[PDB]
Amino acid sequence: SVQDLNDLLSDGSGCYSLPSQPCNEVTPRIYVGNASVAQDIPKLQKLGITHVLNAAEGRSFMHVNTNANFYKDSGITYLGIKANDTQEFNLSAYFERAADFIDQALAQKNGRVLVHCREGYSRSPTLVIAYLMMRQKMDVKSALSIVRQNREIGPNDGFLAQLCQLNDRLAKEGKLKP
C-alpha cells in the first residue's frame, strides 16, 4: 500500500523526479516550495503569502534555519516544525497542528499559505496531503495524486506509511468523501 502510493509518484522505473520549480500552488491558495522561496520575503509578499509553515525548522543541511523573528515586520505569520526527513520521524504527530494552521490561513479570504521544507519534496507535501485528507475529506490516493500533478513530490516511505495509517483511521470513522 505504501508501494501503491510510490507507483502514483513515479513513472514505474524505480526512480523519482525532483521539483522542476522552487514553488508550486498545489491546491487553491496552498503553495509548496523550497528554502529559497521561504527565505525570499519580497517574493513571498508578491505572491500574497500571508502564512508560512516551515516543516523543516533546524540548523543542519536538511533544515531551513528560520523562525518567527525572521518574518517579523514582514506581516507574515509563521509556524515552525523541527521535522527530520527520515523513515522514523513521526510527522503524523504534527498533522493536526499543521492542518489547523493551514485552516487558519485559508479561513481568511485573502490568505495564502506556503508549506515548505528545504527541497519542498518530502515533509511539506506530506503535511498538505494530510490536510486534504482530514479537512477536505479526500482519501490518500486522491489527495496525493492532486498534489503530485502540481509538484514533483516524494514523501519518504515512513511518511507514506503514516498517511496510510491516517487513511484507515479516517475511513474507519467514515470521514472520507464517498
UniProtKB/Swiss-Prot annotation:
Enzyme Commission code(s) on record: 3.1.3.16, 3.1.3.48
Transmembrane segments: none
Domain Tyrosine-protein phosphatase residue range list: 21-172
Primary enzyme class: hydrolase
Entry keywords, A to Z: Cell projection, Cilium, Cytoplasm, Cytoskeleton, Flagellum, Hydrolase, Nucleus, Protein phosphatase
GO CC terms in record: cytoplasm; cytoskeleton; cytosol; immunological synapse; motile cilium; nucleoplasm; nucleus
Catalytic activity: O-phospho-L-tyrosyl-[protein] + H2O = L-tyrosyl-[protein] + phosphate; O-phospho-L-seryl-[protein] + H2O = L-seryl-[protein] + phosphate; O-phospho-L-threonyl-[protein] + H2O = L-threonyl-[protein] + phosphate
Gene Ontology biological-process entries: cellular response to epidermal growth factor stimulus; dephosphorylation; negative regulation of cell migration; negative regulation of chemotaxis; negative regulation of epidermal growth factor receptor signaling pathway; negative regulation of ERK1 and ERK2 cascade; negative regulation of JNK cascade; negative regulation of MAPK cascade
Subunit field text: Microtubule inner protein component of sperm flagellar doublet microtubules. Interacts with VRK3; this interaction activates DUSP3 phosphatase activity.
Function recorded in the entry: Shows activity both for tyrosine-protein phosphate and serine-protein phosphate, but displays a strong preference toward phosphotyrosines. Specifically dephosphorylates and inactivates ERK1 and ERK2.
Name listed for the protein in its UniProt record: Dual specificity protein phosphatase 3
Gene coding for it: DUSP3
